[model samples]
Target: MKERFLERFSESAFLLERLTGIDGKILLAQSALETGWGRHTVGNNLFGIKKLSWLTFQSFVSPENSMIAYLILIKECYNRAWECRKEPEKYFRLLQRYGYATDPMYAEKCLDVYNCVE
Candidate 1:
């Protein structure tokens, strides 16, 4: 499972950090949590991000599209997470603070996944 996930997204996660300053682990872990390593993906949305229409999720033409949109969404709307770019814990914590997820333990759960990788 881990190998499969890394093969699918490691490059994208690396690419994500190069531009966004967010640790690649965060994206990897969040996407893993959101989509279960693509096992239950919906419209190629690796991040489970919502769009218009009654809290419905967004649908992308492909995972690359989802990655592009995910990067843009966080840089614009979830910018505060960047403040803790050096602190993995703080980064995820702030992500939750900004309503990235409703679960109060969202950060911890992502971190759990993050630690398991690599």
Candidate 2:
């Protein structure tokens, strides 16, 4: 799972980091947590993003598109999270507060995955 995920999205994560200023590590951790290491994603939505009516069941052409869409969602809906990029924990926590996930422990789960990856 880890191998395939890295192969598929690592480049996209890095590419997004260049624009979003969000670390690739954070992107990787969130994607890993949301999609269960890519074992449970639908319509290429690696970040479990379904807020935008257009994306709930959208089919992406590639992982790069998914990564860009995910980051755009974060940047628009949870701008504070993008502001807290230096501290991954705080970023995830703020995202949760912004309704990024219904699970109260979402930040912790992402943190656990972040620790493993970074």
Candidate 3:
């Protein structure tokens, strides 16, 4: 995960902005928080997406593909969160609110990390 930081950057910023229309910065924070700055990455899944499912662990074959899969997942699944994609904080808020994760503190943790970004 750590070795692919810059590798993930291009995909996250572009795919996140154009495709998902979300703040790449916050999403990058999502990566850091999820992957321990990439060192803990499983397959190419930088967002801890498939971690919940044993199948997703090997679902992504490449970093770029994983990024696309993640973006599409967020785009299709979390409707409310994507509505506020421009506002990273609210995105996270609605994400967890819409049952993206079970942890109540998940949004808060991502928000805190978002602030530390850059």
Candidate 4:
């Protein structure tokens, strides 16, 4: 029931749930797509955000540090400071507010994966 892969993957899902109010399984699937099953160093960053120059994250000596840093950044940068507001649940509005993803039919693409059968 407990193993390295399960531990890391589950921990990542929990982190995303708390941070973005999104399902952890969605985070897991996005991680798989972004990291190629955690084989890439960039994939070690579960949020799929590119590294930032103004901030530094705990080096991923352990999964714990990596997860914590990922949470911190999402808390900091997403939805134009929505995460900092009293009702950060308004994050969904922020996504529509800022236009983070620009691909045509981006909402459709996200919906296809986000709410799909897991």
Candidate 5:
């Protein structure tokens, strides 16, 4: 699961890094936590972005497109997370505080998974 997840989004992760200036690993960690390594994903809606209806694409989207939308959502809606992008742990924590996830331990889980990357 881990290997496939990483390989699947390897390009999208780099795109996210280049677009948002955030580490690709951080995006991967959050995505891993949110989508259960793609087992639970729906309609390319990654990062658990619920508020942005437009960002939600059909299942037709490439993984890369979904990732681009994810980063854009963070930049446009949860800009606060972007501020702490360098520190993956802090970025996840802030995202939790900003109501990114309903799970109280979302940040902690992401942090745990994040450490396993690379």
Candidate 6:
């Protein structure tokens, strides 16, 4: 399972770098925080993707599932961001678009982490 996860990480790193313009470490840390190292008890959703009515999102059972769900969501967001209530600007904008963290600093903190990692 760990090896499979590592393999997925490599692939996800490239995809995320292209999609979000963020570093691999930043994305990995975000995944770790969100999934709790695969032990987030609720919905097993890494990146904290809630059950949004606007998007046909799926629920998953493990960290790997959460990763897969997230990638799909990213693709959809990129493809149809204009359809969103607040058009998602890449991956980070989900925080604002979905009302996840209302604090003005949420996006800044994400970029801060990205900068620090790089």
Regarding lDDT, does 4 or 6 come out ahead?
6
Query: Model 2: residues >4 Å from true position, as ranges?
Result: 51-56
Write the residue-wise lDDT of candidate 5 on 71-104 in tens digits: 7777887788888888888898998898877799
Find the number of clashing residue pairs for candidate 3: 2
After superposing candidate 1, which stretches have Cα over 4 Å from the reference?
53-55
lDDT by residue for model 1 over 1-118, one digit each (tens)? 7689779999998887897677888778888888887789889998887884122889989886887787777777777876676577888889888887899999999889889874
Worst 10 residues of 2 by lDDT: 49-58
Q: Count the backbone clashes (under 3 Å) in each candidate.
A: 0, 0, 2, 0, 0, 0
lDDT of 2 at 67: 81
lDDT of 6 at 36: 42
The TM-scores, one per candidate, come to 0.88, 0.88, 0.80, 0.49, 0.84, 0.50
The Cα local distance difference test for each model comes to 0.81, 0.81, 0.72, 0.48, 0.77, 0.52
Instruction: Let me know the TM-score candidate 4 reaches against the reference structure.
Output: 0.49
Q: Model 6 compared with the native: what TM-score?
A: 0.50
lDDT per residue, candidate 4, 1-118, as tens digits? Answer: 1134445677657665786665565445444443545666343454445456223322455544555565565466553544533332243335434554445554344444444325
Candidate 3, overall lDDT?
0.72
In candidate 1, list every pair of residues with a backbone clash: none
Model 6 regions more than 4 Å off: 1-23, 33-41, 53-59, 78-101
Give the better candidate number (2 or 6) by lDDT: 2
- Residue pairs whose backbone atoms clash in candidate 4: none
Name the candidate, 2 or 5, with the larger TM-score value: 2
